[PDB]
């Protein structure tokens, strides 16, 4: 009976997590590129103001 219960516990979320994480890595990378670009805008505007 416990054997069948373990068979019934069959897992699908653990499949969803890895996808979520692989997506969140790219999300952090998108924010990273965005801050990288805004940094140079900051540098140029600071140059003009100076």
């Amino acid at each position: 009976q416990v054997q069948e219960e373990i068979s019934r516990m069959s897992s699908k979320a653990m499949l969803k997590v890895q996808e979520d994480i692989k997506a969140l890595k790219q999300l952090l990378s998108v924010a990273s590129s965005g801050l990288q670009r805004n940094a140079l805008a900051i540098d140029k505007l600071k140059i003009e103001t100076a």
Binding site: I21, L24, K25, L28, A31, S32, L35, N38, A39, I42, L45, K46, T49
Partner: protein, 50 residues
């Protein structure tokens, strides 16, 4: 690692954020100085007219 990257990007975004208001502060103080130079100009124009 995503926690690491998100915190660092949070530092980066806060940095660009404060820097934008600071460059705006300089943009304000510089128009403030742009008005007093105009005050001196007005007096110079009056002296030229005299």
């Amino acid at each position: 690692t995503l926690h690491r990257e998100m915190e660092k990007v949070k530092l980066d975004q806060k940095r660009l954020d404060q820097e934008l208001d600071f460059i705006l502060s300089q943009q304000k103080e510089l128009e403030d100085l742009l008005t007093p130079l105009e005050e001196s100009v007005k007096e110079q124009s009056g002296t030229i007219y005299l």
